[PDB]
Amino acid sequence: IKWKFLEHKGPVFAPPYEPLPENVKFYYDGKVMKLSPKAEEVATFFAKMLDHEYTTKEIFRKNFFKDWRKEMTNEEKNIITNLSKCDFTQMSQYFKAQTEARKQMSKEEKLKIKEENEKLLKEYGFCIMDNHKERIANFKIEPPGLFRGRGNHPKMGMLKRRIMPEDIIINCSKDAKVPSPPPGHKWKEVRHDNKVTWLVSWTENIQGSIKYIMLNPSSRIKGEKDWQKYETARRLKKCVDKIRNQYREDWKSKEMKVRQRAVALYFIDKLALRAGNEKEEGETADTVGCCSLRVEHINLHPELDGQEYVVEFDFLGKDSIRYYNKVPVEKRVFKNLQLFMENKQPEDDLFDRLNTGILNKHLQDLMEGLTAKVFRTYNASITLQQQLKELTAPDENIPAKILSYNRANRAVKLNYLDPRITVAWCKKWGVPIEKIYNKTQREKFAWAIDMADEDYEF
DNA sequence: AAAAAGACTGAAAAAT
DNA sequence: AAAAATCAAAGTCTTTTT
Numbered sequence: 001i002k003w004k005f006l007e008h009k010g011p012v013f014a015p016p017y018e019p020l021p022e023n024v025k026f027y028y029d030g031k032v033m034k035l036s037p038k039a040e041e042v043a044t045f046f047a048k049m050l051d052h053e054y055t056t057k058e059i060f061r062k063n064f065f066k067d068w069r070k071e072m073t074n075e076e077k078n079i080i081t082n083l084s085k086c087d088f089t090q091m092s093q094y095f096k097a098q099t100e101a102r103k104q105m106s107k108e109e110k111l112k113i114k115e116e117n118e119k120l121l122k123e124y125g126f127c128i129m130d131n132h133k134e135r136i137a138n139f140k141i142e143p144p145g146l147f148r149g150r151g152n153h154p155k156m157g158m159l160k161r162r163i164m165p166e167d168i169i170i171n172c173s174k175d176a177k178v179p180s181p182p183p184g185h186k187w188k189e190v191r192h193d194n195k196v197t198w199l200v201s202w203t204e205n206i207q208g209s210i211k212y213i214m215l216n217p218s219s220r221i222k223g224e225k226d227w228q229k230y231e232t233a234r235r236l237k238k239c240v241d242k243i244r245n246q247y248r249e250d251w252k253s254k255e256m257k258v259r260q261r262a263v264a265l266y267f268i269d270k271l272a273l274r275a276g277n278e279k280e281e282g283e284t285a286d287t288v289g290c291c292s293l294r295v296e297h298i299n300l301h302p303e304l305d306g307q308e309y310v311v312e313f314d315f316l317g318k319d320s321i322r323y324y325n326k327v328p329v330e331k332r333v334f335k336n337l338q339l340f341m342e343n344k345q346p347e348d349d350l351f352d353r354l355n356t357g358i359l360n361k362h363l364q365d366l367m368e369g370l371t372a373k374v375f376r377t378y379n380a381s382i383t384l385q386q387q388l389k390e391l392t393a394p395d396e397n398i399p400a401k402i403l404s405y406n407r408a409n410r411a412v413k414l415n416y417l418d419p420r421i422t423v424a425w426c427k428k429w430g431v432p433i434e435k436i437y438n439k440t441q442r443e444k445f446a447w448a449i450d451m452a453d454e455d456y457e458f
Numbered sequence: 459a460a461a462a463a464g465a466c467t468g469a470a471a472a473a474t
Numbered sequence: 475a476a477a478a479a480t481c482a483a484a485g486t487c488t489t490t491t492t
Contacts, residue, residue, distance in 0.1 A: 138482080140481090142481080148482085148483075150483065196464090197466080198465075207483095209463090211482085214466080285484090287485090289485085318484065318485055360487070371487065372486080372487090373485095459492100461491080462489100462490080463491080464488080464489070464490085465486105465488080467484080474478085
């Protein structure tokens, strides 16, 4: 269970489309052409992005072009058949202009809207869960627009539709006043599931996944998970030795399987690679993680740059960010990597008999609550802790120590670091927490800030 | 088993 | 005064369906 009482106001739907001004025009093959409202709206999306690289990608241009056409009238389809013939320049000029306008505004102008914004947030940015009011992270529904997929996402440029109340599922307690939908509408459904943490959800049309409206990080519901998250990592700390000794043993098994996971566990532990869940071949942008590494991403070097037994990792991880690395591994690991590449083709899984489910199942068996990602938290937290002891100058000046903080903070993000660690250091050294964590971080880390002392040790 | 369904960081805008 | 400086996709992991 996640709560007992949950009463909130529902989402803020996207502002309705504002038709272009008459003077603002669109040209096709030199000719002028007034676009159907729907076709117009979609075109503005593209127009506002002509100043962006997205518009230079062929995947984007095509995905946009096709989707735009599905919204055109029958005649528009007949005419507009070449993107290269469409002229969005004037539309583009307009929006840029509009943006300039908002920049060149009176303080009188600026303040009004600023207060306008405060009225929405005060009303729709909070909810009541149990005894207290809580802040909501994202209370507005994602506006329609063009999909900004990262990397070579095969769907970038696709049209994200406008979410109606009819697509919205509301969640709140049974005894709560149900938020009423916009006049003339209905929610998709209303449920009272005290097992989930979300207030609102809906299915996004581009990938068919479910989007949710949840609470601020400073939430008890959120905060509590984070607290639990670091605890789990602390527990790994104790069992890591036992764990490292076991997979270090599995490196010599008569079961490539036992060996496949062990090696992967190694990299994860040692290099902090991500689990690597399989992604839909042809529906997503190809990035990989540990378990999903392919033969082609690894290249072994018996000896290299004076280094002996080097593994040359070269692939695209999360967000299509390239991970290149030369890693001197332990012999049995290096060799095992040869065994794993034997008679395989590049386009093949390195860890053919392994997956995140399998791996995590094993980790769980080793310690309840242990999943791959825990190694990233654990590795990051411990490093900062130890680098803080080692680098903090015991007779320092508040600002330089903060440097020490950065230096310690170098070899190691607000996500993989038990905040209590920084909370401890700041007290022991009398460095105001305010000096490291800003208002919001203090908001978010209030729990670590209050339940940890100069004596804290991750 | 495994797929499918479900529940939890980048980058752009805003804050002399 | 003005200008220059400092939200939502994409993963992981769990639960349900097949």
